[PDB]
Amino acid sequence: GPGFGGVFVGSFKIINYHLATIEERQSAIYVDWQSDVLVTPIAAHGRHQIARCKCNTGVYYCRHRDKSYPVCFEGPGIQWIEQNEYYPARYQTNVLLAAGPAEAGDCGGLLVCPHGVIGLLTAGGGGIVAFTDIRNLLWLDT
Ligand SMILES: [Zn+2]
Numbered sequence: 001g002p003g004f005g006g007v008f009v010g011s012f013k014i015i016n017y018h019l020a021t022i023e024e025r026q027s028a029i030y031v032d033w034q035s036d037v038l039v040t041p042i043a044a045h046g047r048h049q050i051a052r053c054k055c056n057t058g059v060y061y062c063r064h065r066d067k068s069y070p071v072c073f074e075g076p077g078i079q080w081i082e083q084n085e086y087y088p089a090r091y092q093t094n095v096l097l098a099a100g101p102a103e104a105g106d107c108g109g110l111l112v113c114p115h116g117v118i119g120l121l122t123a124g125g126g127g128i129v130a131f132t133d134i135r136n137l138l139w140l141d142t
Pocket of ligand 1: 113116
């Protein structure tokens, strides 16, 4: 809803690995440390949908500025080995690169296109923001 709490699809919840808790990690149904994402069952009716598109443009929420920024990002590739306050020097998978304001506190924001959510905000800074594509997880049905 607000846009800073992960994705809630059906009875499942999607969040970043660096922002997850131990209980969620233990009960998670899918995890990708390289992509920095978890998928764990959640007892709720999700009102979100995953984008089954190839959109190259979208809008993301900047929590530390509390504003919506549109941006045209690059496709899902593997990115530079950088080290954060959470992580060691490593390269991430399914990374969408775009230009825009970002901060350490905004980790977890939502990127949306008309079809739905595309990815979560992994990290950003210095005018460059990187997201984790989640389009490969659109199990809306079973
Ligand atoms: Zn789209």
